[PDB]
Symmetry: C2
Subunit: 173 residues, 2 copies
Amino acid sequence: MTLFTENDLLNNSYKSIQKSYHFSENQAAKNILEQAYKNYDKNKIYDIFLSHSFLDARKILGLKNYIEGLGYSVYVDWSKVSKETAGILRERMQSCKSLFFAISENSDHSLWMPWELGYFDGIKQKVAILPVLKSDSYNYLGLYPYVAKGTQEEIWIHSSQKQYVRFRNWLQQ
Amino acid sequence: MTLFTENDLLNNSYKSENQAAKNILEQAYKNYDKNKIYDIFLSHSFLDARKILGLKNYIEGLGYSVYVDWVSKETAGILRERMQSCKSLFFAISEDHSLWMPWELGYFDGIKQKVAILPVLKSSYDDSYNGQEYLGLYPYVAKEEIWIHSSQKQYVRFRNWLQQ
């Protein structure tokens, strides 16, 4: 098994956005993710609430595309700490079965990160950290298990490199 | 109605050296009742052991149970375990913030949905607290009865707040 690459996510972005210019490629992916925010369905039951540290909007998109092409629902968390946006996060985290917080080597933490990781642990108890390496063992980012990749690929939840289980079986526990 | 002043805590501490307050709070931690439903989980940042025990005695003096807090997977299991025994979480902070504070507020928000902030100012003459970032995310505590404030003019008794 292996972990996600910044190469993997950026190439997956070009499955839905153009490969012209960094400025345009950026502006494009932000429109898809804003659209997904406006298209959140209160009556849907999403598999993964996808939260992230600061990442390229292209890389967020390519991560959303990668997980959906694997057969899972993804709501992408899309700026300060308000009573108002705390309410939106509650309603939309309750709409999800699990939470992945993605981190890159350039950004391990975020302003909202520990509150969401704490809140979703309280309501659904299924929280996993998503490591995004630049190039199966990853050691608050050590408080929860981590996500890895496995004729078709699958998502694996790791208490360690030794202890893995299918995401489908990890939700059922 | 006023906010808790640091002198108020140091006063109620005299009833019971910070190393002396540590041993009392350590005994209070060591003597944790599994079958008891505490009223308040007291979480605290930037308050010495003396000012903590003073806050504990003041709350218990008004008649409310208090279990006082005291980075690893093992400890987060104790936090979850002890937090589940309380009805509400009071977070006490003095006039930088702890790395654990947003997590605890959020977790207790998920399991019991009753989180309040307890500012410890050096002097308070009003029932008003405008806190920023996470300290403005939940209602705050003011003080005899403990009152919970969604806003300055929006106040409700602590016993009402629990049943509500």
